[PDB]
Design a protein around this motif. Structure first.
Motif, PDB file in Angstrom:
ATOM      1  N   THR B  92       0.833  -1.196   0.000  1.00 57.15           N
ATOM      2  CA  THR B  92       0.000   0.000   0.000  1.00 57.15           C
ATOM      3  C   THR B  92       0.873   1.253   0.000  1.00 57.15           C
ATOM      4  N   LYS B  96       1.302   4.206  -3.049  1.00 54.50           N
ATOM      5  CA  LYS B  96       1.211   5.650  -2.864  1.00 54.50           C
ATOM      6  C   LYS B  96       2.360   6.426  -3.502  1.00 54.50           C
ATOM      7  N   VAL B 110      -8.585   1.677  -3.800  1.00 56.21           N
ATOM      8  CA  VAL B 110      -8.820   0.491  -2.977  1.00 56.21           C
ATOM      9  C   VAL B 110      -9.035  -0.763  -3.825  1.00 56.21           C
ATOM     10  N   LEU B 263      -8.055  -7.607   8.141  1.00 54.84           N
ATOM     11  CA  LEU B 263      -7.620  -6.991   6.892  1.00 54.84           C
ATOM     12  C   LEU B 263      -7.756  -7.965   5.723  1.00 54.84           C
ATOM     13  N   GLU B 266     -11.347  -8.635   4.705  1.00 58.84           N
ATOM     14  CA  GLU B 266     -11.705  -7.436   3.978  1.00 58.84           C
ATOM     15  C   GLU B 266     -11.346  -7.569   2.497  1.00 58.84           C
TER      16      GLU B 266
ATOM     17  N   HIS D   3     -14.187  -2.042   2.844  1.00 62.32           N
ATOM     18  CA  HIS D   3     -12.733  -2.088   2.967  1.00 62.32           C
ATOM     19  C   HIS D   3     -12.231  -0.910   3.828  1.00 62.32           C
ATOM     20  N   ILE D   5     -10.313  -0.840   6.474  1.00 59.80           N
ATOM     21  CA  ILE D   5      -8.914  -0.930   6.854  1.00 59.80           C
ATOM     22  C   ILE D   5      -7.977  -0.526   5.710  1.00 59.80           C
ATOM     23  N   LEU D   6      -8.373  -0.802   4.468  1.00 57.96           N
ATOM     24  CA  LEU D   6      -7.542  -0.421   3.327  1.00 57.96           C
ATOM     25  C   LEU D   6      -7.550   1.092   3.218  1.00 57.96           C
ATOM     26  N   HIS D   7      -8.715   1.685   3.453  1.00 52.84           N
ATOM     27  CA  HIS D   7      -8.849   3.136   3.424  1.00 52.84           C
ATOM     28  C   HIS D   7      -7.856   3.733   4.418  1.00 52.84           C
ATOM     29  N   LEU D   9      -5.104   2.649   5.737  1.00 49.96           N
ATOM     30  CA  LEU D   9      -3.738   2.548   5.259  1.00 49.96           C
ATOM     31  C   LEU D   9      -3.445   3.548   4.148  1.00 49.96           C
TER      32      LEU D   9
END
Ligand SMILES: CN(CCOc1ccc(C[C@@H]2SC(=O)NC2=O)cc1)c1ccccn1
Ligand SMILES: CC1=C(/C=C/C(C)=C\C=C\C(C)=C\C(=O)O)C(C)(C)CCC1
Lengths: 232, 272, 10, 16
Positions: B92, B96, B110, B263, B266, D3, D5-7, D9
């Protein structure tokens, strides 16, 4: 000619469509069978195309030259992807639906009213529209299909190496073809190659369903397909 | 774009790749061969040895996340999960650092992580593997392929497919600078299910592909059709992921108390 | 695989 | 889906 001559690959495609006549029997005039279930129509079309797929394989340069038992391994490992790619491309003409080799036009909701939505919606978004938006031609589809046919990782293959080399012979011809014909777009080659991941995951989910149709049956399905459908 | 640009992009990506990923292929390979004197990885090849590598942390400080009492197979499975949780975070962060990514629709960002994360984990996992095993815990241990392959019920074959992919993948002999570009190419895929704005994504991947080709031509002149062979791996990765998901369904059906890290649940929900 | 095989050698 | 938790991060990053 030149190992993997792009002209013959196109020929293999051309030599086994569709193309007149066929696009009428199951969507405007008469029609055999007379079934009342829409997942059945696609399975029928698949079975029919399975015979033609073999015809096509023989026309792709160097396939029929390979060892007979290897030929069988390749067609058993790539038939669903090879097939999905054909009807996906043939369906560019139509907006939100698919065109079967038996002349039948399957519509979105129909796919839904059969519980085969999404998987059907992915084909329209991940395959058909992409081929349409970049306008892949019949030659490019033929080479992509050839790349798929010559898959070296197909379990059991006698001499993997020689299959990978044919696939590379195809990569080269396609790339040359793209530059010569589409000089205005340098990344067209990579773009054609990046059509394969979706064909792959979509094809896998398709085989998942077919085995979620074998185990339960009820008005089973056509031979040859059942023969292909006995897992690799 | 222009060469000087493609090369800068390549360098940019490599640096943030060094910044985001602790055990690079370089360092990894350093360990699997012989280089660097300080500590060889502790080899885990069976139950007791796992114990030693595990309960080493028992001497060590108490971080863990499932200190045994729960059968071998499940401890390893939960270990991969936790390593994966770390990875998604490192990935992740790298994402970025890719030009134009944080300027995309947040929902598209996402989606790209959601579908790209496992493909990257499996790609990078190969850097830590040889034909006999994989380095673990920042390279403090080395778990053998034979041991993972011997696990009981369905866990016995959850790593074997990854090893097989790694064997062929490593055959392309890419290095961290090659990988840094490829990973970005994976993240910026315009064919992920559910994307809202494809155009912006494909425009970015377009430039990344050009950078990758140049990088490969310069870094691998005698390697023919490497560019094409490498993109073909993107289809293999796709298969390893659907295949692992299928394996997850099975475990869920045969294991009473499955429980997946938050996670991960998710990421796996409604995936492909 | 009878069918596939027969079709391959003609 | 969400999602969440992805947000997190993506937005703030990873804590220690
Ligand atoms: C065998 N190793 C090396 C790591 O190897 C990995 C294998 C699979 C994954 C993906 C996870 S596993 C899962 O079910 N879902 C996921 O996202 C991530 C890493 C171990 C084993 C125990 C402890 C630490 N390291
Ligand atoms: C697409 C699709 C499926 C399977 C298709 C396969 C495996 C081949 C199709 C070939 C055709 C349609 C060829 C032609 O007509 O030329 C299944 C049933 C799982 C469900 C609905 C979506």
């Amino acid at each position: 000619n030149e190992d993997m001559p792009v002209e013959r690959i196109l020929e293999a495609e051309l030599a086994v469509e569709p193309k007149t006549e066929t696009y009428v029997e199951a969507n405007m005039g008469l029609n055999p069978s007379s079934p009342n279930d829409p997942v059945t129509n696609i399975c029928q079309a698949a079975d029919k195309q399975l015979f033609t797929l073999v015809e096509w394989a023989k026309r792709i340069p160097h396939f029929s030259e390979l060892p007979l038992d290897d030929q069988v391994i390749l067609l058993r490992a790539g038939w669903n992807e090879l097939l999905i790619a054909s009807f996906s491309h043939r369906s560019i003409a139509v907006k939100d639906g698919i065109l079967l080799a038996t002349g039948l036009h399957v519509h979105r909701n129909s796919a839904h009213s059969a519980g085969v939505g999404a998987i059907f919606d992915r084909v329209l978004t991940e395959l058909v529209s992409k081929m349409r938006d970049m306008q892949m031609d019949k030659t490019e589809l033929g080479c992509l299909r050839a790349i798929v046919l010559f898959n070296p990782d197909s379990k059991g293959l006698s001499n993997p190496a020689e299959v990978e080399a044919l696939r590379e012979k195809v990569y080269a011809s396609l790339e040359a073809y793209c530059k010569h014909k589409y000089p205005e777009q340098p990344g067209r080659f990579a773009k054609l190659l990046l059509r394969l991941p979706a064909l792959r995951s979509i094809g896998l989910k398709c085989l998942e369903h077919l085995f979620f149709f074998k185990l339960i049956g009820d008005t089973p399905i056509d031979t040859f397909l059942m023969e292909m459908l006995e897992a690799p | 774009p222009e060469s000087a640009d493609l090369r800068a992009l390549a360098k940019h990506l490599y640096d943030s790749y060094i910044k985001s990923f602790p055990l690079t292929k370089a360092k990894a390979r350093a360990i699997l061969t012989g280089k660097t004197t300080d500590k060889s990885p502790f080899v885990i090849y069976d139950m007791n040895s796992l114990m030693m590598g595990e309960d080493k942390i028992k001497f060590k400080h108490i971080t863990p996340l499932q200190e045994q009492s729960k059968e071998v197979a499940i401890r390893i499975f939960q270990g991969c999960q936790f390593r994966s949780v770390e990875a998604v975070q490192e990935i992740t962060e790298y994402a970025k650092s890719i030009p134009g990514f944080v300027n995309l629709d947040l929902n598209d960002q996402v989606t790209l992580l959601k579908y790209g994360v496992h493909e990257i984990i499996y790609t990078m996992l190969a850097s830590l593997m040889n034909k006999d095993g994989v380095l673990i815990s920042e390279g403090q241990g080395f778990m053998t392929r034979e041991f993972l392959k011997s696990l009981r019920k369905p866990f016995g074959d959850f790593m074997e497919p990854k090893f097989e992919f790694a064997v062929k993948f490593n055959a392309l002999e890419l290095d961290d600078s090659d990988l840094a570009i490829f990973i970005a190419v994976i993240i910026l895929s315009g064919d992920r299910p559910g994307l809202l704005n494809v155009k912006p994504i494909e425009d970015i991947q377009d430039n990344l592909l050009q950078a990758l080709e140049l990088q490969l031509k310069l870094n691998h002149p005698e390697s023919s059709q490497l560019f094409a062979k490498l993109l073909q791996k993107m289809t293999d990765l796709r298969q390893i992921v659907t295949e692992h998901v299928q394996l997850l369904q099975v475990i869920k059906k045969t294991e009473t108390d499955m429980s997946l890290h938050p996670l991960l649940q998710e990421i796996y929900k409604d995936l492909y | 695989h009878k069918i596939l095989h027969r079709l391959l050698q003609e």
